[PDB]
Amino acid sequence: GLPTYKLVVVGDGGVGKSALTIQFFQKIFVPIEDSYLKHTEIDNQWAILDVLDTAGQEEFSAMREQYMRTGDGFLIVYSVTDKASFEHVDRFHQLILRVKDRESFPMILVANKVDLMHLRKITREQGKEMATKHNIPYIETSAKDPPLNVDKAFHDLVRVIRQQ
Ligand SMILES: Nc1nc2c(ncn2[C@@H]2O[C@H](COP(=O)(O)OP(=O)(O)NP(=O)(O)O)[C@@H](O)[C@H]2O)c(=O)[nH]1
Ligand SMILES: [Mg+2]
Ligand SMILES: [Zn+2]
Ligand SMILES: [Zn+2]
């Protein structure tokens, strides 16, 4: 069948992992334990996306490493209003690279909640520096209607996987 990409959304609790996933699959924002399946055409090439919306809790090491092993690409999401979620980007990138036993792997740093500009604590420049440090692309998103770069984040991840 069509090429299948297993995309895994990781990040601290409350950063907007589910809101981004639901916006991407249902085009809704309302403030399902299975991974989500859809067809999508990216750069005139149809594909099947299999998207796992992870839980921001500590979870279990066995369950966590398992879905990291099966992922073809990862979105590392933080909230621009949450400093701790931004600092934990280093932990998510290192942990996924450790599981993969790789120096690099298709991932994109996602700075979510950029609509909350008066609560924003992580600047765009801080976000780009973080992405540059980890050698991954940077994109700013908002899952609140009207959504910002939600489709682009997932599609660009597939593009990275394709150009890997
Ligand atoms: N203003 C705004 N609120 C957002 C955005 N994304 C998520 N939220 C809000 O922030 C809260 C947490 O979002 P949620 O999607 O549950 O985050 P999560 O990363 O899945 N949390 P968990 O790890 O506990 O599953 C919700 O109230 C949601 O509506 C965004 O881009 N903008
Ligand atoms: Mg969630
Ligand atoms: Zn203002
Ligand atoms: Zn890193």
Residue numbers in the entry: 10 to 40, 46 to 178
From the paper:
Mutations in RAS and PI3Kα are major drivers of human cancer. Active RAS interaction with p110α, along with phosphorylated receptor tyrosine kinases (RTK) interaction with p85, activates PI3Kα, allowing it to modify its lipid substrate, phosphatidylinositol-4,5-bisphosphate (PIP2), to phosphatidylinositol 3,4,5-trisphosphate (PIP3).
To determine if p110α and RAS undergo conformational changes upon complex formation, we conducted comparative structural analyses using the structure of p110α and RAS GTPases in their uncomplexed states. Conversely, the structure of GMPPNP-bound MRAS (this study) without p110α lacks electron density for switch-I residues 41–51, indicating increased flexibility and likely adopting a state 1 conformation (RMSD of 0.71 Å, excluding switch I, compared to the MRAS-p110α complex). Solution NMR studies have shown that active RAS proteins transition between two conformational states, termed State 1 and State 2.
